Design a protein around this ligand. Structure first.
Ligand code: SF4
Lengths: 397, 450
């Protein structure tokens, strides 16, 4: 049992390691402090289980000092309010109105455990991280080409997930209805039950078809060989067969696999087509072939398409864990994610302490690349914010 | 304005057969024109509302309304008078319904549905001319995105325009134009994946967005008209018509047969209540006596049979002598029939005039039960009429919204298979009864030849 970081470890991380300035500049959207930070809600989770909401900081130093004094296990970022949330007790409950928050998406491994074999329970490795990687790829595809968003970044959840922070002025100002609309556009797999055929609407929406084409080359390499979940006959019956449309085909495949146990996922995938060809004959064979292809595509999407957490995105007032936070159980830093990121690459707080013992400087530790990446992202966001202000001024004239 | 200049402006406005009603009509119309056009458009909207409350399909509502269009508000005509009728009726109803929020909501909903129907009845060329009259994409941009746009819109085409063949769908798509707008304005269509999205822009289902913009603009203009109404309050001439229009949204028959079950099955619940009160108390107060007498006259009861009816009902308990009945009541009953005074043939009270009544107190039986009875008591008699619990719940939901006439129509329909008049209810029930009797007689005749 690897114990999580101690309270003294959290104090050390907060006093010497947290990139407080970069987070402040990211959330402030301006080099100078503004109401985007003074009126931002922050919620702090303590080791005792206490949860204190509606905290706010006026400056860079105030943020660092309050976080150091509180020493929470983690803290979460809220929306911009019309009034400082820290002054809530002097205000009526109806006076604090949320006005802006970054669009947020949460993806976890929990919805993919039915299709992975390289890890069990709450474990994670590079093999299963391909699910999250494809999820970010598809989500970024949608956000970039369909919504026109530019300033978004992915951050490791700490154990096996990732959070998306869309900081576009258009995305930040979305109402709850608009956020629900974007989520429903992205959340194709509404029913996560693997024991039932999706029966997705046909013809595919261009986003759905594009995602299917993007995911098709990876379906073999991941599912049929690396994970190989349908080698087990019981797992095959539980997850692969229910995605088929024809009862006769399902029964025939079940009997064939009972007579020939432990056929691998690729072999079962080919058996589906072979038995379907043997069964469906005559002038109606083309419809059966088309329906089988549709079911196979639906299973590809069920197995590889992003499975978002739908609550966190719906409302402007929802709180989400801030980046660079320490995961209490693993000690991993919630670092930003690039194309080469894997869960084993996230620095651990104890390792950062060991590095700081040799070199008492954050710039010489393993946390530094992620800090640099975040700083570049913040700089680009600020440049785009200035451009948007100029465009608004031009439009008003 | 010269008549010629007025016609020129109106033609510039109607370049399309459909309008957003952006600019106020200019010109003078007579009071008869004012009230008649207002009442005709109001009837069209009320029929729309009645169809909607019954969950009728769009095609059924269109089919019902087309003859009403040809009769009351002719559309797709080149006559300037019909277009003037539509425009002035719309703006008169704007004046009528701007007073209250609920009236505004009902008006904008009905008017948006009317807009939808009218747009659906237009030709595709006329629809294109109207939408051209919200930036359209160039043909090059359509060609670049043609595959994605066709994939998005193929299902909408198949299910809305019944273009089952792929060739017809492609041929229509080649002629279809698309509008590029931010997805925030069409988030509703984005949710159902009916519109193509690229770089934050939604490519358009156009009827839905057009209806949404029309409803928003109509809401705003109603608000402005409500702000400007008190300046119009100085016109003594229009106020009564506006008030009436706003509130408008809310020997077989003789003295003995009117009590019989054959005739008693046909009355509406108000009339049954008044007759039950008369039977129990052998007396009805002024408003109840007036309502009952005018109904009875409207259903065919002559004056002499009315006098016999009233005398027999009143003298049954012995508390009233015939001398007192002749001294106090005979004159009023004859007057109701136009036999006394100025000989004015009083018309029977519709639902609206009954509701304009002053609320029944203790001992009163007049008014409308659906407005004046408690929910438990109404449930009691509706159970007595062999209505199911779901039907009773629907009727009570209609009563709670203030749609008492809607609930009257509902109880009519459940007990027999839009009514705004007791005599209309009686007449429809009588016609259905005679039709059923004729069908039964025909069945008996057919079963006797085998
Ligand atoms: S809705 Fe009209 S006809 Fe029906 S019971 Fe009420 S007042 Fe009588």
């Amino acid at each position: 049992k690897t114990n999580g970081p101690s309270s003294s470890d959290m104090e050390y991380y907060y006093k010497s390691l947290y990139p407080f300035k970069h987070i402040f500049n990211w959330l402030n959207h301006s080099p100078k402090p503004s109401r985007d930070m003074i009126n931002r809600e922050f919620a702090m989770a303590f080791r005792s289980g206490a949860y204190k909401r509606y905290n706010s900081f006026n400056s860079v130093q105030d943020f660092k000092a309050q976080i150091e004094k509180a020493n929470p296990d983690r803290f979460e970022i809220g929306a911009i309010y019309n009034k400082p949330p820290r002054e809530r007790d002097t205000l009526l409950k109806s006076e604090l109105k949320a006005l802006e928050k970054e669009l947020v998406f949460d993806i976890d491994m929990d919805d993919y455990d039915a299709f992975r074999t390289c890890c069990s329970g709450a474990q994670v490795c590079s093999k299963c991280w391909k699910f999250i990687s494809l999820a970010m790829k598809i989500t970024n595809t949608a956000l970039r080409e369909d919504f026109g968003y530019k300033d978004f970044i992915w951050v490791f959840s700490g154990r096996r997930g990732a959070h998306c922070w869309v900081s576009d002025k258009r995305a930040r100002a979305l109402t709850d209805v608009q956020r629900r609309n974007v989520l429903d556009y992205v959340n194709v797999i509404r029913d996560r039950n693997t024991d039932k055929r999706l029966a997705l609407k046909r013809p595919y929406h261009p986003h759905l078809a594009r995602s299917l084409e993007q995911l098709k080359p990876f379906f073999v390499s991941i599912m049929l060989e690396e994970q190989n979940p349908w080698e087990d006959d019981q797992h095959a019956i539980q997850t692969l067969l229910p995605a088929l449309y024809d009862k006769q085909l399902i029964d025939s495949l079940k009997k064939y696999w009972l007579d020939n146990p432990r056929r691998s996922s690729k072999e079962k995938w080919n058996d589906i087509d072979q038995i379907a060809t043997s069964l469906f004959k005559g002038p109606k064979q083309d419809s059966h072939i088309i329906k089988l292809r549709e079911c196979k595509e639906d299973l590809v999407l069920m197995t590889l398409y992003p499975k978002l957490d739908v609550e966190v995105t719906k409302q402007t007032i929802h709180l989400l864990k801030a980046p660079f936070c320490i995961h209490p159980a693993t000690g991993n830093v919630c670092v930003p994610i690039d194309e080469s990121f894997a869960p084993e690459k996230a620095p651990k707080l104890i390792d950062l302490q060991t590095e700081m013992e040799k070199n008492n400087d954050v710039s010489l530790t393993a946390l530094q690349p992620f800090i640099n990446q975040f700083q570049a992202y913040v700089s680009s966001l600020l440049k785009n914010e200035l451009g948007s202000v100029k465009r608004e001024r031009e439009d008003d004239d | 304005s010269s008549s010629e200049e007025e016609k020129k402006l109106y033609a510039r406005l109607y370049e399309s057969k459909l309008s957003f009603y952006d600019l106020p009509p200019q010109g003078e119309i007579t009071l008869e024109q004012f009230e008649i056009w207002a009442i005709d458009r109001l009837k069209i909207l009320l029929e729309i509302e009645s169809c909607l409350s019954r969950n009728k399909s769009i095609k059924e509502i269109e089919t019902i309304i087309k003859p009403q269009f040809q009769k009351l508000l002719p559309f797709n005509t080149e006559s300037l008078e019909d277009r003037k009728k539509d425009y002035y009726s719309h703006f008169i109803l704007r004046l009528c319904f701007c007073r209250s929020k609920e009236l505004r909501e009902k008006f904008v909903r009905a008017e948006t549905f009317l807009f939808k129907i009218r747009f659906n009845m237009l030709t595709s060329t006329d629809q294109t001319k109207f939408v051209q009259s919200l930036q359209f994409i160039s043909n090059e941009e359509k060609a670049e995105l043609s595959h994605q746009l066709y994939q998005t819109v193929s299902a909408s085409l198949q299910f809305q325009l019944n273009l089952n063949e792929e060739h017809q769908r492609k041929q229509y798509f080649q002629q279809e134009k698309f509008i590029k707008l931010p997805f925030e304005n069409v988030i509703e269509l984005v949710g159902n994946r009916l519109v193509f999205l690229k770089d934050g822009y939604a490519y358009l289902q156009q009827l839905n967005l057009l209806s949404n913009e029309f409803a928003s603009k109509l809401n705003q203009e109603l608000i402005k008209t409500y702000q400007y109404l008190p300046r119009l309050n100085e016109d003594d001439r229009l106020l009564p018509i506006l008030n009436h229009l706003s509130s408008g949204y809310t020997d077989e028959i003789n003295a003995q047969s009117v009590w019989s079950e054959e005739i008693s099955s046909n009355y509406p619940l108000c009339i049954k209540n008044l007759m039950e009160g008369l039977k129990k108390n052998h007396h009805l107060r002024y408003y109840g006596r007036q309502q009952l007498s005018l109904f009875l006259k409207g259903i065919g009861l002559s004056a002499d049979e009315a006098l016999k009816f009233w005398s027999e009902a009143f003298t049954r308990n012995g508390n009233m002598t015939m001398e007192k009945f002749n001294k106090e009541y005979r004159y009023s009953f004859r007057h109701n029939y136009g036999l006394e005074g100025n000989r004015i043939n009083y018309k029977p009270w519709d639902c609206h005039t009954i509701l304009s009544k002053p609320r029944p107190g203790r001992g009163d039986y007049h008014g409308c039960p659906f407005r004046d009875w408690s929910h438990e008591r109404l449930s009691a008699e509706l159970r007595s009429m062999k209505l199911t619990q779901a039907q009773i719940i629907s009727v009570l939901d209609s009563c709670q919204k203030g749609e008492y006439t809607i609930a009257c129509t509902k109880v009519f329909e459940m007990t027999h298979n839009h009514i705004a008049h007791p005599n209309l209810y009686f007449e429809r029930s009588r016609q259905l009864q005679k039709k059923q009797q004729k069908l039964e007689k025909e069945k008996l005749f057919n079963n006797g030849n085998h």
